[PDB]
Amino acid sequence: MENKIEVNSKDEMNKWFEEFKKGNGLVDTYTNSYSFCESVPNLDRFVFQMAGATDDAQKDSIYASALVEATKFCAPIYECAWASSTGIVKKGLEWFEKNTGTIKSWDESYIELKVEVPKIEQLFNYQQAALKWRKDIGFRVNANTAALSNKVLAEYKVPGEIVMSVKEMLSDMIRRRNLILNPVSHEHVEWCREFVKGKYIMAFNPPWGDINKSGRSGIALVATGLAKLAETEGKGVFDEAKKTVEALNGYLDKHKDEVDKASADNMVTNLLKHVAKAQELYKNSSALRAQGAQIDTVFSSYYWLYKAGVTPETFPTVSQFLFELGKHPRGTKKMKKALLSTPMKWGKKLYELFADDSFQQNRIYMHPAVLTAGRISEMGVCFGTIPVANPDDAALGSGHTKSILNLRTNTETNNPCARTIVKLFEIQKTGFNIQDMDIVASEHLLHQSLVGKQSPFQNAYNVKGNATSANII
Amino acid sequence: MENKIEVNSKDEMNKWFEEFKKGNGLVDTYTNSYSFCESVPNLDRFVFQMAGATDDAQKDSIYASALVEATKFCAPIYECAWASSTGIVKKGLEWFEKNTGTIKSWDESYIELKVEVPKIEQLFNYQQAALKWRKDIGFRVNANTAALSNKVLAEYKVPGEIVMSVKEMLSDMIRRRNLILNPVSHEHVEWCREFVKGKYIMAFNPPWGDINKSGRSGIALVATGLAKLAETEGKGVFDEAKKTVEALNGYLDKHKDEVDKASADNMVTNLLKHVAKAQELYKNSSALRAQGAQIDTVFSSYYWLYKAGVTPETFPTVSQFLFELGKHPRGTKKMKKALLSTPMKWGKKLYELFADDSFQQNRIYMHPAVLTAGRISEMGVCFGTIPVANPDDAALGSGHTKSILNLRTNTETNNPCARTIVKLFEIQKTGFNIQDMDIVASEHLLHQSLVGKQSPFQNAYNVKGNATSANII
Amino acid sequence: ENSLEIEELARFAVDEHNKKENALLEFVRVVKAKEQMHMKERQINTMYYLTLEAKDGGKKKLYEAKVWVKKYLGDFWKDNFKELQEFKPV
Amino acid sequence: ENSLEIEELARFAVDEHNKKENALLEFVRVVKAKEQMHMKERQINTMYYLTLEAKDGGKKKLYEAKVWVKKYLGDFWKDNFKELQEFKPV
């Protein structure tokens, strides 16, 4: 029908929300933003069910149901409402036509990206485009809708009762991150790590052999080493790869009193060429291209809306769809049935955008603008939580994964978020073989919590540091 | 030699400044920041020189000499020092490597912008990039290095003796701004101005005739009116107006029993169309891109440094160059000669960036990141005032235009800034026909002084209001 | 319409009680019923107060049941939910 | 090579005196001169006390001149500046 959320400014929003809150009775006892969650979902039974389950369909069903119950009532109403507010809808959908050119890099390469791995510049273009999208329509209303440029947590506070269960998860995350990083030898990496910290002299006569020796890869090990160190420990190394270079150009060309200036003058080129190449390797490193694949929920959602040919008037039907989808666990099959059968013109188009089977490599690499059935949940949290045609229905509950981020992360409430994630993880573990999955949702949610996300609408790309290097206490 | 302004923090800075100040004996009697200006510059003789002059070369020489004498000793030492401080140099030069992506819009489109007119998004991108650039390297140390978000002053006190000379300038500035129009009547503007404030009833009976009456070009008078108003009173009008229609359609719901619901349903649509078209007209207005073409001195300076391939180690020679350039008036000829022949390679490169004659339209439209000979003076105030290789030489004096902003604008000293600017203007007036010039330095300086700039290092883009609408008292 | 529906809820209620308390009640027939519905566009909430007959081994007994039904007429999925909220003998 | 160089400064001295103080004295030749320079890396300040002969219509008479010279050895432009500070008969 029609969008019952007329908002174009934060004040209007706040009025609408304050109005909505009293008539519905929202709470934030367990959540960072006001919601219907009045009790931490108890997912115990789904475990015993998963244990008792035999066939796979029932296991998937159980998991889906569990996840729904988890996310059913704990959606951040303010931000969710703002996200589907007439204003932001209008501006957000408009923005794509006014900027079709800037995004051609991945936009027009969509059908290719369904199957192929994206190139780094496409990821870059995407992220920048997302940040611009956020800036241009004045999306930021509070912290929960901000873009994080801050820092990953080094200490993650959890209840004792699950610590080992969390540490177990990380151990499986660490394991995975290490397969992305692989395999160039470790001693070389140590050479670099210890080199930059302040022991340059080794460079004259490296212990591995020769400065230019190549391995199975067709190039000097130095480059791969630097690339590796950079992959595992950020861009900063490339700055120290100019500070620590003072001794190179200095001791070789400048210091005419200590070292030669003929057969040594060319040594300056020798390593710096490898540093340059090391940057070139780091840019295209699996770690980075995986890192760049990190998805911006709301932007991708609105992009998919745009691609689906959704207008600010057909949008309520989409919202109603996502709501009804989140309301009660219902499979992909039924989802596709409902997608195709609807009178609405978007459903078929939106269906055509799916790329589940199309993809070949590890899903972690799939460009963040590629829709898949599983990724519908990305839209679900933006539009599905509150059906704009009749927002009062939101009290019924409509679960979508990332709403779990709305849960509190502090000891006062014993971190219901962590408990939930762990629970879902252990359910998945009881039901399936974790090792054999490309991506474990719960692990991802944990990783998102670990970089300090507290709402699904925050952009955590510009966050700095390695989240898996955190300590659980 | 090497940059002898060792600073990375405000702490080091203040000490350095206090150290420099005692040995040199700076004053701020006549200046907003401490400087060598111990007497308000007397530019009287240059007028009579300009009167007696016949050939143009001599006139140009005279003007140059006058301007140098004006700007020679009144440079803001603290800020200028901070601007060329080793820390800010490193961070400022560094930032461009770490952020090439965000600035690709104009950075990589450089060679074309030398000749062609920039598009609005390029200006916007530039300004945004500048504002971020300031933040990312922690440039702000005080007010004189801040980014202004305030509003232009409407009341500007100058001594009687020069009032007529100022209003004359504005009168010539206003005339120039009117060239934005290629003229729509004023009554429409008053109508809109009073209309938007919350008076929908006016829509029923426009004094000119009907709401849809067209002008020249034959476009909706409403659209041109709002379009005009936005320029004079910010972007907001398109919301405050669009708002004023909601109250109409509201009012059309009560009297839907009295008035039609057919030809009245279209009044709102019609007006909304006029708001849209007005937005579209304002988007492409000369006033806006001209407003946006405003240059950010330090950012463009550091950008040009970066583009010239200057490093934090070669910078002292650049500072020395700009110093020697500002110290004594020397033509474009000598500059171009000296630029190439220097052993340093940047000198060679930086010259290649010039685009003076290349432009065809009014030079005011040229993108603010495009270097030209005349625009070198933008760098001069950042680096030239104090030669970092030998700072004491700063006592010799090195004049660059924007240093005039360092002069005081208050009644205590009878506003030496205004006096100086007026004097220069009157000199150029004595020498040349102002009307026939694309850019009048004095007018621009006044225009910058009018938005309440008191240091050349301030960003006055986020300032709000029309500066030429100010009153002289 | 309504009379064609209750008996299902009665059988459901008994069948539910059989599980809830591990018994062998056999549904006989219904005698009284009191519906109370709340419709709100898409959202429907019906509460039923039932009085039914059930066998327990042979003898026919009366039972005061109470059932909640929540419905949501959706565009893509019509949702139905029943919940025996209370079941006691008369 | 100073004797091959200095006197040029004298010629300058009269020529200014001719203009600033409204006269047309004609230079003959110099006999005495006393330089005093202060250098500071790039910055140089030389004060000259000259005693020169000049014709005024025909008769040759002596004059005590005084010249200031400020120099700045730059990397891109070497700067020179002269200023007749005093010119008196002797």
Residue numbers in the entry:
A (entry chain A), B (entry chain B): 1 to 182, 192 to 482
C (entry chain E), D (entry chain F): 32 to 121
List sentences quoted exactly from the publication behind this structure:
Affimer affinity reagents are a class of non-antibody binding proteins based on a phytocystatin consensus sequence that scaffolds two variable peptide regions that represent target recognition sites.
Two Affimer-NP/CCHFV NP complexes were elucidated per asymmetric unit. As previously published structures show, CCHFV NP contains two major domains: a globular core and an extended arm. Although no crystal structure of CCHFV NP in complex with RNA has been solved to date, analysis of its electrostatic surface potential reveals a continuous positively charged region, likely the binding site for RNA, comprising residues R45, K72, S149, H197, K222, R225, K237, Q303, K336, R339, K342, K343, K345, R372, and K462 (highlighted in blue in Fig 4A–4C). The interaction between monomers involves residues 320–354 within the head domain of one molecule and residues 210–219 and 260–272 of the arm of the adjacent molecule (highlighted in pink in Fig 4A–4C). As both oligomerization and RNA-binding are required for assembly of functional CCHFV RNPs, the location of the Affimer-NP binding site also offers a likely explanation for its ability to disrupt CCHFV mini-genome activity.
